[model samples]
Target: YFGKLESKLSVIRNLNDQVLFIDQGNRPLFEDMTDSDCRDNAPRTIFIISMYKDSQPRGMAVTISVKCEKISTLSCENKIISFKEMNPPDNIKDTKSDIIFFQRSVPGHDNKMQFESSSYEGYFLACEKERDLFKLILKKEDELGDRSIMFTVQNED
Candidate 1:
């Protein structure tokens, strides 16, 4: 009944050739790094995707860090996305800490997908410019016209 479709951990990278990284505070960000430390410690860029147990058609839940750091949206005007401590087994439908995302495959892009906030509809997971840094955030699809909301999600070998 549970853990049937749990997908393997994957690597997410945007169009800018930047890898998705989780900071010390567990904030999801698109990082551009090439130094030895950055290259060596590539495990931080790994992300796990779990299928929401009661999802109707299509959705996904991400678990980062030690076990409880689930990908979630912050309660702010920007609806900035971040990871919070929420064990999947304990919390599934808690709206307070949003987890489920409307995962969809890209129209033309092969193997690329987009994640839209299920709780906050119309907002999508995107890597956009913020304070001179490319931050992973929940943004409106219309607002990101020319920029990319599509991300290449591939299993980590």
Candidate 2:
């Protein structure tokens, strides 16, 4: 669900002429199926949505990225996880190109590092649903303790 809020004309004017950004709708849509969840580690998912002022709705676009991580007490217990890097699946291919060049998440002590893609602008509705495809690749290790995961998305340009 989304709400409409009015902003001052001046504020609206400050936005760039050719940029579209969108945030994932309010839901734990991907939390339970992430790598962390399968590995008994903390899980997190970030969705980014953007909108442009194009006359046609078909011109809209969207980007989705997911991250997973875990921490443990001994060397045998700590592990870092990454999603399989390949072409976007069939479900997401027709919607839009996945921003592979800038899709990476690094695990830290209690947080995760997020990187944004340096490609195109705009948010496509189809791309929004394809982001959940990552839930299929979760693995576990035998060394770490106490873990955390986070997902986030933002616009660049």
Candidate 3:
């Protein structure tokens, strides 16, 4: 999912920099969009929190406060959130199926291939519409809860 929705979400290289901590459970399911009809245009992925609490305090919880801009075509308003169940949220319904069924066809290699989330950032969630700027956060969870941080690349400048 590269050009589907114009998700200008920053491609963050470093993961161990200063960032806020969003406690999570072991259930963050990341869906890839490499198989959708518009897969070529999608933003490559969707990081489903799967489970968490609703304290509102965690909304856009950043290490340091700064103006946010939603570069991606998708608009995620919940910022850091808590998906009530295993299913993805309604906001991301259009993306879930294709993403979950993600597969790849290598050039000259008829053997189609499937892959897991490569980067810790998982996939950026698509917003209902498009936003100018936003500080997006996602988590890759398992059974134990305490897992790796998803995408937390704040402004480089």
Candidate 4:
């Protein structure tokens, strides 16, 4: 099944500090977008969260990638970014297919995070057109809890 949710991308201020957490019975699936056509002239990032049946708080995972064009052409450079796969909870099963890629975005960057599984992958772009920020949280049966994931972006001062 496929699902889409919008949320602010401010889980961490520094790109290198971003992390992923998945609950039991859940898995994170990341799609490969190394080859694709994009024309959007703005910086962008991608995050993915996967969950399973009866999983408490559900599984949460995110892959943030920036368009190279935006970084090179626009000279929009941030601190050196990196992606680290956190160990899933003891109850959670690690699905091998979950592989995420982090792309650097330049000012004039125009790239998309393409994936094979249409259901789990989500696309998010940061630009003046959106006007609003996005924050997403996935849980089991929509139960209320602090099980939501938060993301955010900021300009260097």
Residue 26 of model 4: what lDDT?
25
Prediction-by-prediction clash tally? 0, 22, 14, 23
The window of 10 residues in a row where model 2 has the poorest summed lDDT is: 7-16
lDDT per residue, candidate 3, 10-86, as tens digits? Answer: 31211233222112332222322223375465534332222111223212211111122211111222334332323
- Write down the lDDT of every candidate, Cα atoms only: 0.58, 0.23, 0.25, 0.25
lDDT of 2 at 118: 22
TM-scores for candidates 1 onward, in order: 0.66, 0.19, 0.19, 0.20
Candidate rank order under TM-score: 1, 4, 3, 2
Task: Specify the highest-TM-score model's number.
Answer: 1
Off by over 4 Å in 4: 14-58, 70-157
The CA lDDT at 77 in model 1 is: 35
- Candidate 4 lDDT tens digits, 57-127: 33333333222222110111121122333421223243312322122223222322211111232322221
Which candidate model has the greater TM-score, 1 or 2? 1
Worst window of 10 by summed lDDT in candidate 3: 62-71
Residue runs of model 1 more than 4 Å from their true location after superposition: 1-4, 32-45, 53-78, 90-97, 143-147
